Swiss-Prot record:
Name of this chain's protein: Peregrin
Subunit description: Component of some HBO1 complex composed of KAT7/HBO1, MEAF6, ING5, and BRPF1. Component of the MOZ/MORF complex composed at least of ING5, KAT6A, KAT6B, MEAF6 and one of BRPF1, BRD1/BRPF2 and BRPF3. Interacts (via PHD-type zinc finger domains) with unmethylated histone H3 at 'Lys-4' (H3K4me0). Interacts with trimethylated 'Lys-36' of histone H3 (H3K36me3). Interacts with ING5; interaction directs BRPF1 to H4K4me3-enriched chromatin at the 5' of active genes. Interacts with KAT7.
Disease tied to this protein: Intellectual developmental disorder with dysmorphic facies and ptosis: An autosomal dominant neurodevelopmental disorder characterized by delayed psychomotor development, intellectual disability, delayed language, and facial dysmorphisms, most notably ptosis. Additional features may include poor growth, hypotonia, and seizures.
Protein's organism: Homo sapiens (Human)
Free-text tissue specificity from the UniProt record: High levels in testis.
TM spans (from-to): none
Gene: BRPF1
Length: 116
């Protein structure tokens, strides 16, 4: 909501972001894709995203509603599916992250709705 207390909501986002990052068992989503090793990445991906950047956005108060937070998580997944071939560790890991992050987000959204 417009008038909900922001600090409980941001603590919820911090807890949720930690739970999502814990699903990065391949350790490929928690820092920006290294452009020095993937120099054509921005030719394909318009909005890179990763869990460190999400933490920066959170602490800069760029997430004022739950949907924008979830949209950036979804970008981590969709960027990875888009850039990488299906028969890669990266692609398979993005599918796993989509599956595991979904339950985290469903529970977190229920908590966010109770704050409005
Ligand atoms: C989700 C995704 N899509 C793509 C195309 C990639 C990708 O190329 N990841 C890569 N990681 C590395 C190595 N990694 C090691 C860490 C310890 C630090 C961190 C900055 C770099 C090289 S390339 O990841």
């Amino acid at each position: 909501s417009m008038e909900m207390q922001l600090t409980p909501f941001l603590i919820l986002l911090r807890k949720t972001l930690e739970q999502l990052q814990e699903k990065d068992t391949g350790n490929i989503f928690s820092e920006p894709v290294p452009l020095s090793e993937v120099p054509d990445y921005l030719d394909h991906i318009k909005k890179p995203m990763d869990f460190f950047t999400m933490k920066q956005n959170l602490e800069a108060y760029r997430y004022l509603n739950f949907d924008d937070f979830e949209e950036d998580f979804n970008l981590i997944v969709s960027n990875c599916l888009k850039y990488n071939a299906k028969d890669t560790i990266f692609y398979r890991a993005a599918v796993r992250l989509r599956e595991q992050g979904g339950a985290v987000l469903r529970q977190a959204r229920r908590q966010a709705e109770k704050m409005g």
